[PDB]
């Protein structure tokens, strides 16, 4: 079942009394029709942020930004593949030594890396816009819909991957912790692997700057917990990988006999 097939958050169209109330509200609005009206007090107008129409518009804005970011990533991947093919297929009449081929390969790698970083930055901008658009849907019931959860999970995952590839590891921790609270996302081991790496980076940064011992212990414990969880989810409990990770964590952490 594709939750994004209709590209909408909630379908808006039953009680006879409700229909009568809607008709009377429409009749009242007809009398006071004034498109030039602007409310000095913003509260009553800001009540619109709890409606279905506002939520649908914001959902579609976020979907548009998310599609733009995914398009950036995929187009960059296609460009990299095509560029590698073209570089391999073109003639080199002045290339006769092995070190010249090594230099050419290094140049191609430099170009590819630069393009990849540029694409990641642009996609991250789009994903941040999508996150901001999704953050201002204030209806608790509409945030519980499957379509909202699917779009939020996709946007969070793409943002986390882009930000990790840009080497901003600590910034991904709050987003990952939000991500693993949606549906059964806690059962996906890649999230725990990302969390283990990010918490290891935080612990190393605390150690390098000689920061407080409390933060060092907290970061190390979080890293060990998420590493063990990622190991169990991918390889299973009481597996050789699980036993090895248990031994490593036991060595790493503080225990008392």
């Amino acid at each position: 079942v594709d939750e994004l097939l209709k590209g909408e958050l909630v379908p808006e169209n039953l009680t006879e009394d409700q229909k009568k109330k809607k008709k009377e509200i429409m009749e009242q609005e007809s009398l006071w029709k004034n498109p030039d009206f602007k409310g000095y007090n913003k509260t009553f107008q800001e009540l619109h942020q709890l409606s279905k129409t506002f939520a649908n518009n914001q959902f579609r804005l976020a979907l548009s930004n998310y599609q733009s970011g995914v398009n950036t990533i995929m187009k960059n991947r296609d460009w990299v593949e095509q560029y590698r093919k073209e570089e391999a297929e073109k003639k080199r009449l002045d290339e006769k030594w092995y070190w010249q081929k090594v230099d050419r390969k290094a140049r191609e790698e430099r170009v590819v890396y630069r393009e990849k970083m540029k694409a990641k930055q642009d996609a991250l901008n789009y994903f941040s816009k999508a996150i901001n658009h999704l953050d201002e849907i204030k209806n608790p019931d509409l945030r519980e819909r499957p379509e909202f959860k699917r779009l939020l999970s996709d946007v969070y995952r793409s943002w986390i991957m882009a930000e990790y590839d840009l080497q901003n590891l600590p910034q991904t921790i709050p987003i990952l912790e939000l991500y693993i609270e949606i549906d059964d996302n806690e059962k996906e081991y890649p999230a725990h692997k990302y969390l283990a790496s990010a918490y290891s980076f935080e612990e190393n940064m605390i150690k390098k700057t000689k920061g407080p011992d409390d933060m060092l212990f907290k970061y190390r414990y979080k890293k060990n917990v998420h590493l063990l969880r990622a190991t169990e989810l991918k390889y299973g409990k009481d597996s050789p990988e699980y036993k090895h990770i248990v031994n490593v964590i036991n060595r790493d952490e503080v225990i008392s006999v």
């Binding site: 909408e8 498109p35 129409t53 804005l61 658009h133």
Partner: protein, 225 residues
């Protein structure tokens, strides 16, 4: 016009698994709903029982001012195709002959949040193919701020208000409303959606070509050793 014939050539997409779509474009296959008003999305998008095509494109109020991110309002343009008779037993979408169009429904929506202005326009052609001139079976509906109610017929006493068939409009030299509508909107709208369907087909066939080329590259990669 003959574009109604062309709209029968988009029956190829019924058995074609659509994965690549244009930006802010929604497309799905389904069955007619109660009274045949709209298309209801089917759980399985590849079943032969599918008989309707739904194509939608949305935008945002204020995009011409560069203010789409301000959330000023919503708008979208969609139209739905309706066919009759079960689709063929074979599952291949590549070889598909045009089928008969039961009805063609077009839907224009716009809602300005700041101005509290909502406009909905609906066109329904219940006799698409069969006559080059079927004005008596073309329904036009205009609704502003949820008025008039949905499905309200037009009375000759109050002309221009409510759901009116196209034959109720005047087409004199003084006011060629029929001819102006047909020349300006309907032809361009049908052509735009036909070209969108063809573009979707082009992209989803380029997808398979790319898959074949990728397999060829993977196989060729083993010749280095």
């Amino acid at each position: 016009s003959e574009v109604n014939k062309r709209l029968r050539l988009h029956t190829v997409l019924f058995k074609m698994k659509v994965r690549t779509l244009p930006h802010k474009t929604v497309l799905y296959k389904g069955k007619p709903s109660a009274d045949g008003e709209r298309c209801e999305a089917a759980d399985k998008q590849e079943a032969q029982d599918n008989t309707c095509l739904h194509l939608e494109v949305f935008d945002f109020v204020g995009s011409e001012d560069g203010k789409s991110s301000k959330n000023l309002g919503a708008k979208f343009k969609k139209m739905e195709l309706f066919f009759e008779g079960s689709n063929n037993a074979d599952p291949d979408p590549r070889k598909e002959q045009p089928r008969n169009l039961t009805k063609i429904r077009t839907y224009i929506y716009q809602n300005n949040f700041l101005l509290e202005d909502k406009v909905i326009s609906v066109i329904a052609d219940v006799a698409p193919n069969g006559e080059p001139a079927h004005n008596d079976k073309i329904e036009l509906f205009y609704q502003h701020d949820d008025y008039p109610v949905w499905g309200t017929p037009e009375t000759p006493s109050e002309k221009g208000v409510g759901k009116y068939i196209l034959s109720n409009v005047e087409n004199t030299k003084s006011n060629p409303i029929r001819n102006n509508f047909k020349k300006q909107f309907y032809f361009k709208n049908l052509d735009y959606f036909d070209k969108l369907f063809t573009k979707i087909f082009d992209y989803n066939d380029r997808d398979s070509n790319k898959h074949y080329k990728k397999n060829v590259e993977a196989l060729k990669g083993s010749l280095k050793y």
